Design a protein around this ligand. Structure first.
Ligand SMILES: [N-]=[N+]=CC(=O)OC[C@H](N)C(=O)O
Ligand SMILES: [Ca+2]
Ligand SMILES: [Ca+2]
Ligand SMILES: [Ca+2]
Lengths: 182, 361
């Protein structure tokens, strides 16, 4: 998965998350055409009967969360991320850090994230203090000994006070922000 | 170039070559949609493990002219041959993820190219040929691979060794390493066909036929009729209020929008910035909140053309207040399960709640 974002001089804003599921998808490359084929249908439940069961011509449930935040009907911030079910965690934590904590956009993105979808599944980024990790686990959590990078947020802030755009690319990949003047 | 400022436009992407190509479209007077199309082609070449015309996406667009926000939804569709139990063995056991994620049955009908064209028809101001050509050049003449692509090739070499990928990415049975030139002649040719004919080469053409043929080679049911049936949809965002802002995000068939909004509604009342960002309190309250929202996601979320997702109920302020009663600094909630958001809207679910093993990735 990858997330990118674009703002232009006409007020158009794009927030675009795009994927082939696993890295390289199924790993199948179309012989003579050089393109990788998605494994997106494993995003369906393997056991049927549920909301996200396999059916022909059905779209498998995604966790992709391309987002635009508005203030008084005007876009002010784009957010999105790769990382399967963790995307929800990357996007809400970035928004929490920016709007609730009042961090800089780059601090909001770089701040270590956590993810836990269930009592049996925990991940955290390097930077959670060791003593806090131990207290969390003593309380019943299951943060392991090894931290892992979570997601890859690209964001644009639209600064109408300063008449500028600010682009931020997460350090978790080699992504870049490139501004444009006239 | 991790942070940038600009008066007249901004691009942020996961690959510096894709950011440069996007910026150049804006520098030449293209709009954000022009640039985004150029960027998807460039990522398809430079970050081939993460996205491209073999996949699907959600492109949210705010239109600066109409002031409307919409989403070009190119999520893949199961072919007609898919069956509800196709990921179970003959004894009804889930086929391991490392096996099913590599099988032709896993391949959805790709929508990304359909989405680029739908976006172009609506908002495009540059010729499609100007937007795809920078990517033909990178595919044709090659580029030196970055650390993330080199790491990806290394980590996925088992999978890549069993397919036509091994010839491009595992030359002499060895993974390309950071700085090695990646040349993708066949991909350049596929981009040239699309540049000449447009997407009919894909959805009603030789690329579609080759896709169907290799899917069937790996045990899948996809035919040219599946590719010819495919169309993207246009979605309205799911909207929520948070902290004086309006948030537009992705509706079903993503779980992303509703559950990102649900987490923000559940934690808003806890005023987390009273606690240090690296405090026990912040991490504990986020973990407790995520357990509830992910449990709702596992029970209630799917393709809204097939199933009713209770979006109204899942974000209802009384539902929020009921779920918040399970979130506390006093203890960890050990009884994590979906709530009953159907209690807060009209109708009933047209599905069961089916537990799944925790095996994806
Ligand atoms: C890689 C990755 O983020 O996976 C995306 C996932 N298939 C989804 O659609 O939520
Ligand atoms: Ca606050
Ligand atoms: Ca990080
Ligand atoms: Ca049997």
């Amino acid at each position: 998965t990858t997330h990118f974002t674009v703002t232009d001089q006409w007020g158009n804003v794009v927030s675009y998350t795009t994927t082939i599921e696993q890295l390289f998808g199924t790993g199948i490359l179309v012989p003579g055409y050089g393109l990788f084929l998605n494994n997106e249908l494993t995003d369906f439940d393997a056991i049927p009967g549920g909301a996200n069961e396999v059916q022909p011509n059905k779209r498998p449930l995604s966790s992709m969360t391309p987002t635009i935040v508005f203030k008084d009907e005007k876009p002010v911030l784009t957010v999105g991320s790769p990382g399967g079910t963790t995307i929800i965690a990357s996007v809400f934590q970035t928004i929490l850090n920016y709007f609730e904590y009042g961090m800089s956009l780059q601090d909001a993105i770089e701040e270590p994230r956590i993810y836990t979808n269930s009592l049996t599944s925990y991940r955290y980024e390097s930077g959670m203090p060791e003593d806090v990790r131990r207290k969390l686990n003593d309380f019943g959590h299951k943060f392991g000994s090894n931290p892992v990078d979570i997601g890859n947020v690209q964001s644009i802030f639209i600064d109408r006070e300063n008449k500028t755009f600010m682009g931020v690319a997460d350090s978790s990949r080699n992504g870049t922000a490139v501004g444009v003047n006239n | 170039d991790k942070v940038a400022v600009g008066k007249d436009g901004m691009v942020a992407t996961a690959h510096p070559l894709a950011s440069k190509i996007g910026a150049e479209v804006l520098k030449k007077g293209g709009n954000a949609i022009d640039a985004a199309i150029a960027i998807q082609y460039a990522l398809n070449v430079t970050e081939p493990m993460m996205s491209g015309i073999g996949g699907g996406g959600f492109m949210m667009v705010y239109d600066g002219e109409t002031r409307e926000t919409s989403i070009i939804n190119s999520r893949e569709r199961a072919p007609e041959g898919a069956k509800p139990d196709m990921f179970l063995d003959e004894d009804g056991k889930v086929i391991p993820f490392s096996e099913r994620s590599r099988h032709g049955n896993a391949v959805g009908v790709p929508g990304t190219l359909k989405g680029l064209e739908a976006a172009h028809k609506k908002w495009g101001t540059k010729k499609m040929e100007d937007l795809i050509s920078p990517s033909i050049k990178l595919t044709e003449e090659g580029f030196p691979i970055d650390s993330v692509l080199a790491d990806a090739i290394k980590d996925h070499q088992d999978k890549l060794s069993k397919t036509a990928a091994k010839d491009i990415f595992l030359p002499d049975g060895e993974p390309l390493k950071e700085g090695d030139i990646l040349v993708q002649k066949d991909l350049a040719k596929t981009f040239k066909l699309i540049r000449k004919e447009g997407s009919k080469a894909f959805y009603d053409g030789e690329i579609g036929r080759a896709i169907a043929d290799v899917v069937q080679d790996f045990g899948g049911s996809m035919t040219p009729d599946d590719l010819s049936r495919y169309e993207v949809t246009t979605d309205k965002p799911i909207w929520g209020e948070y902290h004086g802002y309006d948030i537009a995000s992705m509706p079903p068939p993503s779980s992303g929008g509703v559950f990102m909004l649900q987490v923000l509604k559940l934690i808003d009342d806890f005023h987390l910035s009273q606690y240090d960002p690296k405090s026990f309190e912040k991490y504990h309250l986020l973990a407790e909140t995520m357990h509830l929202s992910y449990a709702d996601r596992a029970a209630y979320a799917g393709d809204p053309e097939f199933v009713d997702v209770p979006l109204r109920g899942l974000l209802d302020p009384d539902y929020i207040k009921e779920r918040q009663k399970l979130i506390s600094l006093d203890s960890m909630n050990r009884d994590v399960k979906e709530g009953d958001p159907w209690k807060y809207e009209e109708g009933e679910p047209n599905y069961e709640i089916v537990p799944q093993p925790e095996d994806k990735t």
